[PDB]
Amino acid sequence: GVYHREARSGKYKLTYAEAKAVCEFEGGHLATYKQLEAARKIGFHVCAAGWMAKGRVGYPIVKPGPNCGFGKTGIIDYGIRLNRSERWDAYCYNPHAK
Numbered sequence: 001g002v003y004h005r006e007a008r009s010g011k012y013k014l015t016y017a018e019a020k021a022v023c024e025f026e027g028g029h030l031a032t033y034k035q036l037e038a039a040r041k042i043g044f045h046v047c048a049a050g051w052m053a054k055g056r057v058g059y060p061i062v063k064p065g066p067n068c069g070f071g072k073t074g075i076i077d078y079g080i081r082l083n084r085s086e087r088w089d090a091y092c093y094n095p096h097a098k
Contacts, residue, residue: 001098002031002039004046005090012087016051019090029053031091033077036060039098040075050089055080057088 007013023030030053036044040060047068049059058077059068069076 001042002036002044002091002093004048004050005092012089014051014090015087016055016084016090019051019092022090023092028093028095031093032056033058033075035093036075036091042098048089050091051084052091055084057081 005014019030030051032053033056036058037060040062044060045062047059047061047065049057049068051057056077056079058075059065060075061068061073063073065072065076
């Protein structure tokens, strides 16, 4: 299944280029919206924005999301942001399960 990751010696210090380095190494691939959705149907709920394939970034949420974005419900990705220079979290994926 999918999982969230954050800096060990900090917090939000992971860029798209970095997220690509740690992953894809073993032939894996960064989690995307399409792949993320399949997880939401399994009760997957994570309120946090992180870089992904094609510089894509988003913070999927079943309903609650005060800290992330502002109210509203359901994923609210902007579809590839130009803030590729700003600092944010990051997501990954592994064939370990699902």
